[PDB]
Design a protein around this nucleic acid. Structure first.
Ligand SMILES: CC[C@H]1OC(=O)[C@H](C)C(=O)[C@H](C)[C@@H](O[C@@H]2O[C@H](C)C[C@H](N(C)C)[C@H]2O)[C@](C)(OC)C[C@@H](C)C(=O)[C@H](C)[C@H]2N(CCCCn3cnc(-c4cccnc4)c3)C(=O)O[C@]12C
Ligand SMILES: [Mg+2]
Ligand SMILES: [Mg+2]
Ligand SMILES: [Mg+2]
Ligand SMILES: [Mg+2]
Ligand SMILES: [Mg+2]
Ligand SMILES: [Mg+2]
Ligand SMILES: [Mg+2]
Ligand SMILES: [Mg+2]
Ligand SMILES: [Mg+2]
Ligand SMILES: [Mg+2]
Ligand SMILES: [Mg+2]
Ligand SMILES: [Mg+2]
Ligand SMILES: [Mg+2]
Ligand SMILES: [Mg+2]
Ligand SMILES: [Mg+2]
Ligand SMILES: [Mg+2]
Ligand SMILES: [Mg+2]
Ligand SMILES: [Mg+2]
Ligand SMILES: [Mg+2]
Ligand SMILES: [Mg+2]
Ligand SMILES: [Mg+2]
Ligand SMILES: [Mg+2]
Ligand SMILES: [Mg+2]
Ligand SMILES: [Mg+2]
Ligand SMILES: [Mg+2]
Ligand SMILES: [Mg+2]
Ligand SMILES: [Mg+2]
Ligand SMILES: [Mg+2]
Ligand SMILES: [Mg+2]
Ligand SMILES: [Mg+2]
Ligand SMILES: [Mg+2]
Ligand SMILES: [Mg+2]
Ligand SMILES: [Mg+2]
Ligand SMILES: [Mg+2]
Ligand SMILES: [Mg+2]
Ligand SMILES: [Mg+2]
Ligand SMILES: [Mg+2]
Ligand SMILES: [Mg+2]
Ligand SMILES: [Mg+2]
Ligand SMILES: [Mg+2]
Ligand SMILES: [Mg+2]
Ligand SMILES: [Mg+2]
Ligand SMILES: [Mg+2]
Ligand SMILES: [Mg+2]
Ligand SMILES: [Mg+2]
Ligand SMILES: [Mg+2]
Ligand SMILES: [Mg+2]
Ligand SMILES: [Mg+2]
Ligand SMILES: [Mg+2]
Ligand SMILES: [Mg+2]
Ligand SMILES: [Mg+2]
Ligand SMILES: [Mg+2]
Ligand SMILES: [Mg+2]
Ligand SMILES: [Mg+2]
Ligand SMILES: [Mg+2]
Ligand SMILES: [Mg+2]
Ligand SMILES: [Mg+2]
Ligand SMILES: [Mg+2]
Ligand SMILES: [Mg+2]
Ligand SMILES: [Mg+2]
Ligand SMILES: [Mg+2]
Ligand SMILES: [Mg+2]
Ligand SMILES: [Mg+2]
Ligand SMILES: [Mg+2]
Ligand SMILES: [Mg+2]
Ligand SMILES: [Mg+2]
Ligand SMILES: [Mg+2]
Ligand SMILES: [Mg+2]
Ligand SMILES: [Mg+2]
Ligand SMILES: [Mg+2]
Ligand SMILES: [Mg+2]
Ligand SMILES: [Mg+2]
Ligand SMILES: [Mg+2]
Ligand SMILES: [Mg+2]
Ligand SMILES: [Mg+2]
Ligand SMILES: [Mg+2]
Ligand SMILES: [Mg+2]
Ligand SMILES: [Mg+2]
Ligand SMILES: [Mg+2]
Ligand SMILES: [Mg+2]
Ligand SMILES: [Mg+2]
Ligand SMILES: [Mg+2]
Ligand SMILES: [Mg+2]
Ligand SMILES: [Mg+2]
Ligand SMILES: [Mg+2]
Ligand SMILES: [Mg+2]
Ligand SMILES: [Mg+2]
Ligand SMILES: [Mg+2]
Ligand SMILES: [Mg+2]
Ligand SMILES: [Mg+2]
Ligand SMILES: [Mg+2]
Ligand SMILES: [Mg+2]
Ligand SMILES: [Mg+2]
Ligand SMILES: [Mg+2]
Ligand SMILES: [Mg+2]
Ligand SMILES: [Mg+2]
Ligand SMILES: [Mg+2]
Ligand SMILES: [Mg+2]
Ligand SMILES: [Mg+2]
Ligand SMILES: [Mg+2]
Ligand SMILES: [Mg+2]
Ligand SMILES: [Mg+2]
Ligand SMILES: [Mg+2]
Ligand SMILES: [Mg+2]
Ligand SMILES: [Mg+2]
Ligand SMILES: [Mg+2]
Ligand SMILES: [Mg+2]
Ligand SMILES: [Mg+2]
Ligand SMILES: [Mg+2]
Ligand SMILES: [Mg+2]
Ligand SMILES: [Mg+2]
Ligand SMILES: [Mg+2]
Ligand SMILES: [Mg+2]
Ligand SMILES: [Mg+2]
Ligand SMILES: [Mg+2]
Ligand SMILES: [Mg+2]
Ligand SMILES: [Mg+2]
Ligand SMILES: [Mg+2]
Ligand SMILES: [Mg+2]
Ligand SMILES: [Mg+2]
Ligand SMILES: [Mg+2]
Ligand SMILES: [Mg+2]
Ligand SMILES: [Mg+2]
Ligand SMILES: [Mg+2]
Ligand SMILES: [Mg+2]
Ligand SMILES: [Mg+2]
Ligand SMILES: [Mg+2]
Ligand SMILES: [Mg+2]
Ligand SMILES: [Mg+2]
Ligand SMILES: [Mg+2]
Ligand SMILES: [Mg+2]
Ligand SMILES: [Mg+2]
Ligand SMILES: [Mg+2]
Ligand SMILES: [Mg+2]
Ligand SMILES: [Mg+2]
Ligand SMILES: [Mg+2]
Ligand SMILES: [Mg+2]
Ligand SMILES: [Mg+2]
Ligand SMILES: [Mg+2]
Ligand SMILES: [Mg+2]
Ligand SMILES: [Mg+2]
Ligand SMILES: [Mg+2]
Ligand SMILES: [Mg+2]
Ligand SMILES: [Mg+2]
Ligand SMILES: [Mg+2]
Ligand SMILES: [Mg+2]
Ligand SMILES: [Mg+2]
Ligand SMILES: [Mg+2]
Ligand SMILES: [Mg+2]
Ligand SMILES: [Mg+2]
Ligand SMILES: [Mg+2]
Ligand SMILES: [Mg+2]
Ligand SMILES: [Mg+2]
Ligand SMILES: [Mg+2]
Ligand SMILES: [Mg+2]
Ligand SMILES: [Mg+2]
Ligand SMILES: [Mg+2]
Ligand SMILES: [Mg+2]
Ligand SMILES: [Mg+2]
Ligand SMILES: [Mg+2]
Ligand SMILES: [Mg+2]
Ligand SMILES: [Mg+2]
Ligand SMILES: [Mg+2]
Ligand SMILES: [Mg+2]
Ligand SMILES: [Mg+2]
Ligand SMILES: [Mg+2]
Ligand SMILES: [Mg+2]
Ligand SMILES: [Mg+2]
Ligand SMILES: [Mg+2]
Ligand SMILES: [Mg+2]
Ligand SMILES: [Mg+2]
Ligand SMILES: [Mg+2]
Ligand SMILES: [Mg+2]
Ligand SMILES: [Mg+2]
Ligand SMILES: [Mg+2]
Ligand SMILES: [Mg+2]
Ligand SMILES: [Mg+2]
Ligand SMILES: [Mg+2]
Ligand SMILES: [Mg+2]
Ligand SMILES: [Mg+2]
Ligand SMILES: [Mg+2]
Ligand SMILES: [Mg+2]
Ligand SMILES: [Mg+2]
Ligand SMILES: [Mg+2]
Ligand SMILES: [Mg+2]
Ligand SMILES: [Mg+2]
Ligand SMILES: [Mg+2]
Ligand SMILES: [Mg+2]
Ligand SMILES: [Mg+2]
Ligand SMILES: [Mg+2]
Ligand SMILES: [Mg+2]
Ligand SMILES: [Mg+2]
Ligand SMILES: [Mg+2]
Ligand SMILES: [Mg+2]
Ligand SMILES: [Mg+2]
Ligand SMILES: [Mg+2]
Ligand SMILES: [Mg+2]
Ligand SMILES: [Mg+2]
Ligand SMILES: [Mg+2]
Ligand SMILES: [Mg+2]
Ligand SMILES: [Mg+2]
Ligand SMILES: [Mg+2]
Ligand SMILES: [Mg+2]
Ligand SMILES: [Mg+2]
Ligand SMILES: [Mg+2]
Ligand SMILES: [Mg+2]
Ligand SMILES: [Mg+2]
Ligand SMILES: [Mg+2]
Ligand SMILES: [Mg+2]
Ligand SMILES: [Mg+2]
Ligand SMILES: [Mg+2]
Ligand SMILES: [Mg+2]
Ligand SMILES: [Mg+2]
Ligand SMILES: [Mg+2]
Ligand SMILES: [Mg+2]
Ligand SMILES: [Mg+2]
Ligand SMILES: [Mg+2]
Ligand SMILES: [Mg+2]
Ligand SMILES: [Mg+2]
Ligand SMILES: [Mg+2]
Ligand SMILES: [Mg+2]
Ligand SMILES: [Mg+2]
Ligand SMILES: [Mg+2]
Ligand SMILES: [Mg+2]
Ligand SMILES: [Mg+2]
Ligand SMILES: [Mg+2]
Ligand SMILES: [Mg+2]
Ligand SMILES: [Mg+2]
Ligand SMILES: [Mg+2]
Ligand SMILES: [Mg+2]
Ligand SMILES: [Mg+2]
Ligand SMILES: [Mg+2]
Ligand SMILES: [Mg+2]
Ligand SMILES: [Mg+2]
Ligand SMILES: [Mg+2]
Ligand SMILES: [Mg+2]
Ligand SMILES: [Mg+2]
Ligand SMILES: [Mg+2]
Ligand SMILES: [Mg+2]
Ligand SMILES: [Mg+2]
Ligand SMILES: [Mg+2]
Ligand SMILES: [Mg+2]
Ligand SMILES: [Mg+2]
Ligand SMILES: [Mg+2]
Ligand SMILES: [Mg+2]
Ligand SMILES: [Mg+2]
Ligand SMILES: [Mg+2]
Lengths: 48, 275
RNA sequence: GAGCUAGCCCUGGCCAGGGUGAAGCUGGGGUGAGACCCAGUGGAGGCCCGAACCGGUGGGGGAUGCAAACCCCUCGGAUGA
RNA sequence: GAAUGCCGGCAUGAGUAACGAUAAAGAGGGUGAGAAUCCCUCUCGCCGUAAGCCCAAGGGUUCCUACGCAAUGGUCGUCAGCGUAGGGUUAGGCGGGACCUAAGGUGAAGCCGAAAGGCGUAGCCGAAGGGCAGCCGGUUAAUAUUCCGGCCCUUCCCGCAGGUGCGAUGGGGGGACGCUCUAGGCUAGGGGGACCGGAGCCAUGGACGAGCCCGGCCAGAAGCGCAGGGUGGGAGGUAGGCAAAUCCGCCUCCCAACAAGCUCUGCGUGGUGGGGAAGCCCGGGUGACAACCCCCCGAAGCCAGGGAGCCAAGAAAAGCCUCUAAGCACAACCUGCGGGAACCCGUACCGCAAACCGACACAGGUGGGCGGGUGCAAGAGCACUCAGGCGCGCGGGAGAACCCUCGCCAAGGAACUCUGCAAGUUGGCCCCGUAACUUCGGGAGAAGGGGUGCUCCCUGGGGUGAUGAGCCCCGGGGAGCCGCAGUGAACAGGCUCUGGCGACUGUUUACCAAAAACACAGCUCUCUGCGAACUCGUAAGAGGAGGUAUAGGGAGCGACGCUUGCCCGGUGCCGGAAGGUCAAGGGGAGGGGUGCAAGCCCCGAACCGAAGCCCCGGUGAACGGCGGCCGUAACUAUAACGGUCCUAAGGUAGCGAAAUUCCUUGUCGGGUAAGUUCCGACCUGCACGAAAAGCGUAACGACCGGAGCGCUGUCUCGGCGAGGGACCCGGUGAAAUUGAACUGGCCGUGAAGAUGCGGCCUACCCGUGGCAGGACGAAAAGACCCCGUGGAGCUUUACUGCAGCC
RNA sequence: CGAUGUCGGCUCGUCGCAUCCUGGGGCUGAAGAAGGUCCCAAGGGUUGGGCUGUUCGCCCAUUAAAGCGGCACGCGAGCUG
RNA sequence: UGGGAGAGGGUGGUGGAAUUCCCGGAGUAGCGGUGAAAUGCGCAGAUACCGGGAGGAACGCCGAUGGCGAAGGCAGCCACCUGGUCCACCCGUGACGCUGAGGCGCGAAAGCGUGGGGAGCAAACCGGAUUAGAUACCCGGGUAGUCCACGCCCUAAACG
RNA sequence: CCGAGGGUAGGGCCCGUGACUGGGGCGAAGUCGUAACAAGGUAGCUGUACCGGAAGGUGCGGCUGGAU
């Protein structure tokens, strides 16, 4: 049957992307925490 | 004269449609239409605030002339009578001798080919707009401004009329379509005669799908729900109300008056409505 | 977090083929005029049968599965909410 | 040493299940250390509205080549979507951007919010919608509308020529629209040809033939032709289109009107440029100077912004045209020609799948286009086949039980069983024919029947064309032939009678319930006078609705038919300007503290003082409720009648052992040989009853009862057969579970059901196929139940707050 | 209660005997045939259907007879639901 | 041809009286009701009186023993549209007549459907009385209905 | 070929019969009330509508076959 992951590059960038996160207090804290943890990538990869 | 159907389906047995007998032109005036943003009962938060709305036929909005004191003294000609899906009444296209074109809601008995006019000295003739203080007492009237220059507000549904009952200073007394007696300022504009399409109240939708075409989604009974949803929810099997009948939000729905007490227009409502 | 699922909004797309034969129109009859009758034309419908498509009724299989809901037979809708 | 402990290692189950669709394989020849598994050839089978082809998403080198086989691949492997390396994606015209707007998002102005932030007009962003200029062939190992060839085209810059009041983010026109049905002419596509081109073939009994087999096109500028769309001309006035306006709008006048004229598309032709089969020989080359023509069928595509009907009344904005304003009329714009200029990103490959979503090379999921031929009434259905693509990444044997999927069955025919569950039957088309009842539509495919192939003869009408031939499509009559059987294969209703429920088509518990549940048109009550009520929000602001009582919210009922009684004492709601109670506040009789005193300070009675509550009324399609005992008639029985107690009032009509009836399989009738079910009645209704509607109702139902016919492997009652497994051999090789085990029966005993204790009996050691009685067998720290001053959802006239409202 | 699956049916048996039938007996208010009642006896046998989930029961047609109980109301790692 | 009388019919308009309700005034201890009463209403200010307003239905005197129509039936007044009928003249047609099974149309009230309207009245219904009871007569309330439009129903002591 | 008739299926008319149910007629001396006949103690009858143990009552309209 239809499973739950249905990749969509535009959806991925627009929901979890860098500019989405920066527009929002909670989104910025996400960047602050993922940068403080030292993640090699701050938002999901998507090819545009 | 609503048209019936032979019972060749379960639903055509009861469906009735309007005769459309007065309509003379079947596509609207391109200079006077604009896109009607369908809301679906959602507000600017995206929240449903009016339940069971959505999914009706696409529509264009006809811009209507609810302030006819716009063009005092300038006669117009009734050019067409048209279908408007945004209202129950039909609409009338006026070609002003100006060359300007406008839509009014079409009163009962209006005829394509006649002239109409707006102003304090207009003939007491169907389709003419005057300030209320100049219409002779007794005349039935429609598209009535509630405050001067603010625009027609009252009696615009198909087949409705207000009657002029008397004067009192700057204010005339009206019998509204609801039967309430209210004072309205004499400088408020109004249009002689009742609204057309009186047979509108006699249309039998006939099937569920016709309600869907109108943008009306199915209404769910509170008694058919659960307690988390509604005061009437729950129960083993069916259940009477088991409390004073209530809305989804708790307030009582049989008789509880809801007009605000200290409202400033109370000084102008003479008799609350009938029946 | 609505890339699943629910509703709505905008913009596109899809619905083999066959059956039934509403209104109206015309002709004929009828009548004071009518209603109305008959034939023709007409092509209506949450109409009918049936693929795609959308469903998931009964039964069997599967049950450390091909599958954390599937498979076979059968069955519902299929111009419409 | 124990925590169903944690981490890791290794065992048991076991050489066990399994190796992923039952579309299917065999041989020869290669290669190589090694071959069922890689390569080639021949044979066989499977898909063919796909299991073929082309896009889009998503994936991201998986593409091509060489070199490999440790691991990955469910076996093998020389192979590979694997490892290493090298190569490979080419655009002014295709797609997106340098264009436009849609929902929505964002947001100078402005509004709001403790902060964060929330709104918000314009404007900006936003596409698979609008707009915009490329077609055919060739070429690579791998890209091609991109490279190359042929023929076309767009925009920008500059120049020349002719012309013109030129000029825009401003005005206007246009763009610009639904659903169903649909005309005319075309094209895509396809069928046929005794014509045109072709390497050949003559078999095995016949055929050297009007024989077989193969193919008979594609693109094309201007012009021309056909078929379509779009479009009135001139004048005078003018106050409207937020300045202007010669435009547009309105009025008058003349002329033109199924036309024509102008314009824009499609199709055809078109200079010219390409393509070109079987067969044969090593992807090539020949065929080949290949030919390239006629007839028919014919789109759902094109002309298109076509036509008609209908109600539910069917985006925007730019490009484009027109009008003018500042301006400028050495300019500028328009037309034609010439030269120049023309950027960024994508382009490999998979793409119904082994490359995407499902942990897997996973029987599942994934949007658009193309989808040939014949026959079956049609069709995308069905069978077989073209092009093309596959045989599903373990095999070889055997021919036990048992399982699955399938085929047949003597006699019987539902006797099976909770139930005809399941499986038979029936099955398309054409014709004859068709009942109660009905809302006159239907019920209806009712039911039940007859026909169905092939040959020959005669004949009616249509389409094309020409009226004729040919081709094609619809028929009618007559005489025959064969078989068990002519929709000869495949696809394709079993039917009737009668209840309950729900009117109906719809909807639902993704993944145990599809229903009688929800919804539904319709009915009623009620709120709402518009800055509406109501709803979301602290607000601003939205929705309601750019609506206005024939409208909008809420509630119940639930098509339709006939109906919907009595109770307002209690709760609710509605009305009541009196009265009663009532907070803050007002008032200040009179008290108290303190100071020598002026004063300062504190307590405070009467009385004035809202909503609410009390009180007085109303109100049932508001919450709700609608009795008991005793007596009575000239056979008996029963009580039309009466007495009395209580109530706010004592259940009306209709219905009733019911989806409701406890006693209960009530009683009687019906159906049956027999009927706890069913149907029809009766009525002492435990405990129906009138919009939580009462009683009916044609039609409808994958709903639930009862019956009958047809037919059956359901059964008496089983039998045989098929294939996939199970079994044996080679390859690979899990699992839950597991205190350890050297693990028998009886009768006892034991914490009360003993392989393990007693006593007897029985028993050589170890396996394989099987069966499930035991190991209180496995699985999940019982869901039932209780307990915990454990938790959560839910209710209310529990308590106490809060929103909201007054 | 860190789980002993719980009615009935079906299938498959097996055991007890307080025996339904068949074998052998005594008594009889046993003439005969037919019964009644008690004693011995468990070898074998103990039907098909309608109703109901039913066990049980009633009924139909037969029968030599249409037994009564146990085996976790025998038997769901055997099936049904 | 010329005339006449008439609530004959249909449509639209419109006038005064009266009842009810509402607003204002003024006013106070009862009103209403019956055989007698009670229910009811009234100091929350009724009844009785005055001014205003709304709304429905019916049409006093004229009015008669009258008139018109086929019957049912028709009553303020105005206009429009339309029927029948009677008289006078003796002008036209030349038996074109009578009746009338079927058919068709009309058809009081009540009743039915979908809308509207609703003052008064009033089935049902509630209450107060009466009574042995009183599911009645009498009284106080009261819903259909009475009224309008359209559509059915088609009955009657539809009688002379 | 036709053909008595037999069979299958589905209709129409009639007759008998059926739990139970509707009212009707009749029946020496039953129970309830008193609707009608006099103004029958509310004049009666009437079509219709609604209600009530029963006769009946009431509404709307009509008739005199109504009395004073
Ligand atoms: C069919 C397979 C399942 O077995 C049964 O379902 C079985 C018939 C039982 O019911 C089993 C016997 C139960 O035990 C009993 O529990 C009782 C409470 C007590 C009993 N004894 C103790 C007496 C005890 O034996 C229990 C609890 O199973 C629920 C066992 C318990 C260990 C389980 O939960 C167990 C893990 C089950 N489960 C959940 C099933 C969820 C629902 N589901 C069902 N089908 C699908 C499905 C269908 C199709 C496709 N995909 C999924 C999903 C599974 O995935 O596998 C199961 C074993
Ligand atoms: Mg899904
Ligand atoms: Mg998706
Ligand atoms: Mg995307
Ligand atoms: Mg997206
Ligand atoms: Mg976002
Ligand atoms: Mg983003
Ligand atoms: Mg912040
Ligand atoms: Mg910050
Ligand atoms: Mg990481
Ligand atoms: Mg780094
Ligand atoms: Mg992130
Ligand atoms: Mg109809
Ligand atoms: Mg009809
Ligand atoms: Mg109209
Ligand atoms: Mg526009
Ligand atoms: Mg909006
Ligand atoms: Mg918004
Ligand atoms: Mg709402
Ligand atoms: Mg909504
Ligand atoms: Mg309209
Ligand atoms: Mg409206
Ligand atoms: Mg006003
Ligand atoms: Mg309505
Ligand atoms: Mg609509
Ligand atoms: Mg509704
Ligand atoms: Mg509902
Ligand atoms: Mg409920
Ligand atoms: Mg519920
Ligand atoms: Mg919730
Ligand atoms: Mg609640
Ligand atoms: Mg409740
Ligand atoms: Mg409930
Ligand atoms: Mg209940
Ligand atoms: Mg419920
Ligand atoms: Mg209720
Ligand atoms: Mg209750
Ligand atoms: Mg409540
Ligand atoms: Mg409120
Ligand atoms: Mg009001
Ligand atoms: Mg999505
Ligand atoms: Mg379809
Ligand atoms: Mg027509
Ligand atoms: Mg349909
Ligand atoms: Mg059909
Ligand atoms: Mg299924
Ligand atoms: Mg599904
Ligand atoms: Mg089945
Ligand atoms: Mg399946
Ligand atoms: Mg199938
Ligand atoms: Mg089917
Ligand atoms: Mg169908
Ligand atoms: Mg279809
Ligand atoms: Mg639709
Ligand atoms: Mg220890
Ligand atoms: Mg463990
Ligand atoms: Mg632990
Ligand atoms: Mg561990
Ligand atoms: Mg571990
Ligand atoms: Mg470990
Ligand atoms: Mg380690
Ligand atoms: Mg290990
Ligand atoms: Mg091991
Ligand atoms: Mg081992
Ligand atoms: Mg084993
Ligand atoms: Mg296994
Ligand atoms: Mg497996
Ligand atoms: Mg298959
Ligand atoms: Mg196949
Ligand atoms: Mg081989
Ligand atoms: Mg090698
Ligand atoms: Mg190999
Ligand atoms: Mg090898
Ligand atoms: Mg193979
Ligand atoms: Mg090979
Ligand atoms: Mg094919
Ligand atoms: Mg995309
Ligand atoms: Mg991947
Ligand atoms: Mg390897
Ligand atoms: Mg290897
Ligand atoms: Mg290596
Ligand atoms: Mg491997
Ligand atoms: Mg694998
Ligand atoms: Mg490449
Ligand atoms: Mg190019
Ligand atoms: Mg640039
Ligand atoms: Mg902000
Ligand atoms: Mg954006
Ligand atoms: Mg954009
Ligand atoms: Mg675009
Ligand atoms: Mg382009
Ligand atoms: Mg081109
Ligand atoms: Mg020019
Ligand atoms: Mg347009
Ligand atoms: Mg438009
Ligand atoms: Mg569009
Ligand atoms: Mg439509
Ligand atoms: Mg072409
Ligand atoms: Mg063809
Ligand atoms: Mg002007
Ligand atoms: Mg050559
Ligand atoms: Mg299409
Ligand atoms: Mg088009
Ligand atoms: Mg068109
Ligand atoms: Mg816009
Ligand atoms: Mg200037
Ligand atoms: Mg100059
Ligand atoms: Mg650039
Ligand atoms: Mg490429
Ligand atoms: Mg697929
Ligand atoms: Mg693949
Ligand atoms: Mg595989
Ligand atoms: Mg797959
Ligand atoms: Mg072909
Ligand atoms: Mg066919
Ligand atoms: Mg295979
Ligand atoms: Mg396959
Ligand atoms: Mg395989
Ligand atoms: Mg073997
Ligand atoms: Mg198979
Ligand atoms: Mg055979
Ligand atoms: Mg047999
Ligand atoms: Mg049978
Ligand atoms: Mg038989
Ligand atoms: Mg049976
Ligand atoms: Mg049954
Ligand atoms: Mg069959
Ligand atoms: Mg068949
Ligand atoms: Mg057949
Ligand atoms: Mg019948
Ligand atoms: Mg019939
Ligand atoms: Mg029947
Ligand atoms: Mg019936
Ligand atoms: Mg009929
Ligand atoms: Mg048939
Ligand atoms: Mg038929
Ligand atoms: Mg043959
Ligand atoms: Mg069928
Ligand atoms: Mg239902
Ligand atoms: Mg239903
Ligand atoms: Mg019902
Ligand atoms: Mg019904
Ligand atoms: Mg449907
Ligand atoms: Mg479910
Ligand atoms: Mg569930
Ligand atoms: Mg689930
Ligand atoms: Mg299921
Ligand atoms: Mg269903
Ligand atoms: Mg539901
Ligand atoms: Mg429902
Ligand atoms: Mg329904
Ligand atoms: Mg209803
Ligand atoms: Mg209503
Ligand atoms: Mg709120
Ligand atoms: Mg708005
Ligand atoms: Mg319904
Ligand atoms: Mg309901
Ligand atoms: Mg009926
Ligand atoms: Mg009450
Ligand atoms: Mg009360
Ligand atoms: Mg009350
Ligand atoms: Mg004070
Ligand atoms: Mg209660
Ligand atoms: Mg109560
Ligand atoms: Mg009643
Ligand atoms: Mg009963
Ligand atoms: Mg019974
Ligand atoms: Mg019943
Ligand atoms: Mg009951
Ligand atoms: Mg019972
Ligand atoms: Mg019972
Ligand atoms: Mg019985
Ligand atoms: Mg019987
Ligand atoms: Mg009884
Ligand atoms: Mg109930
Ligand atoms: Mg029914
Ligand atoms: Mg259904
Ligand atoms: Mg169903
Ligand atoms: Mg049966
Ligand atoms: Mg039978
Ligand atoms: Mg068998
Ligand atoms: Mg076999
Ligand atoms: Mg061996
Ligand atoms: Mg091995
Ligand atoms: Mg291996
Ligand atoms: Mg040990
Ligand atoms: Mg040991
Ligand atoms: Mg052992
Ligand atoms: Mg042993
Ligand atoms: Mg013990
Ligand atoms: Mg023991
Ligand atoms: Mg032992
Ligand atoms: Mg020992
Ligand atoms: Mg010991
Ligand atoms: Mg021992
Ligand atoms: Mg021992
Ligand atoms: Mg022994
Ligand atoms: Mg074994
Ligand atoms: Mg065992
Ligand atoms: Mg245990
Ligand atoms: Mg065991
Ligand atoms: Mg056990
Ligand atoms: Mg635990
Ligand atoms: Mg526990
Ligand atoms: Mg547990
Ligand atoms: Mg317990
Ligand atoms: Mg406690
Ligand atoms: Mg405690
Ligand atoms: Mg607790
Ligand atoms: Mg919970
Ligand atoms: Mg336990
Ligand atoms: Mg355990
Ligand atoms: Mg258990
Ligand atoms: Mg366990
Ligand atoms: Mg003897
Ligand atoms: Mg004897
Ligand atoms: Mg003895
Ligand atoms: Mg024995
Ligand atoms: Mg038992
Ligand atoms: Mg029993
Ligand atoms: Mg015997
Ligand atoms: Mg016997
Ligand atoms: Mg036993
Ligand atoms: Mg025992
Ligand atoms: Mg047990
Ligand atoms: Mg027991
Ligand atoms: Mg027990
Ligand atoms: Mg048991
Ligand atoms: Mg058992
Ligand atoms: Mg089981
Ligand atoms: Mg069991
Ligand atoms: Mg077990
Ligand atoms: Mg077992
Ligand atoms: Mg066991
Ligand atoms: Mg069950
Ligand atoms: Mg006073
Ligand atoms: Mg009124
Ligand atoms: Mg007369
Ligand atoms: Mg004469
Ligand atoms: Mg009448
Ligand atoms: Mg009384
Ligand atoms: Mg008395
Ligand atoms: Mg008379
Ligand atoms: Mg014979
Ligand atoms: Mg009397
Ligand atoms: Mg009398
Ligand atoms: Mg009398
Ligand atoms: Mg009465």
């Amino acid at each position: 049957m239809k499973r739950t992951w249905q990749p969509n590059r535009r959806k991925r960038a627009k929901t979890h992307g860098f500019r989405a996160r920066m527009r929002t207090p909670g989104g910025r804290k996400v960047l602050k925490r993922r940068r403080q943890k030292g993640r090699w990538r701050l938002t999901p990869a998507v090819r545009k | 004269a609503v048209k019936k159907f032979k019972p060749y389906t379960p639903s055509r047995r009861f469906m009735t449609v309007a005769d459309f007998s007065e309509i003379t032109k079947t596509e609207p005036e391109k200079s006077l239409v604009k896109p009607l943003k369908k809301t679906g009962g959602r507000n600017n938060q995206g929240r449903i605030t009016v339940r069971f709305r959505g999914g009706g036929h696409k529509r264009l909005y006809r811009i209507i002339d609810f302030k006819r004191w716009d063009k005092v003294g300038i006669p117009a000609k009734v050019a067409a009578i048209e279908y408007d899906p945004n209202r129950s009444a039909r609409i009338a296209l006026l070609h002003y001798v100006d060359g300007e074109k406008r839509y009014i809601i079409a009163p009962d008995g209006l005829q394509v080919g006649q002239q109409v006019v707006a102003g304090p000295d207009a003939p007491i003739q169907v389709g003419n707009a005057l300030p209320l203080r100049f219409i002779p007492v007794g005349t039935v009237v429609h598209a009535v401004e509630l405050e001067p220059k603010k625009g027609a507000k009252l009696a615009r549904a198909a087949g409705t009329s207000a009657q002029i009952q008397g004067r009192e200073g700057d204010y005339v007394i009206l019998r509204l379509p609801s039967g309430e007696l209210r004072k309205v300022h004499g400088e408020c504009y109004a249009t002689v005669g009742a609204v057309g399409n009186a047979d509108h109240k006699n249309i039998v939708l006939g099937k569920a799908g016709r309600s869907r075409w109108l943008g009306r989604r199915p209404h769910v009974r509170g008694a058919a729900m659960n307690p988390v949803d509604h005061p009437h929810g729950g129960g083993e099997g069916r259940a009477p109300r088991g409390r004073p009948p209530a809305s989804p939000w708790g307030w009582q729905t049989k008789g509880l008056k809801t007009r605000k007490r200290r409202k400033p227009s109370s000084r102008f409502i003479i008799a609350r409505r009938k029946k």
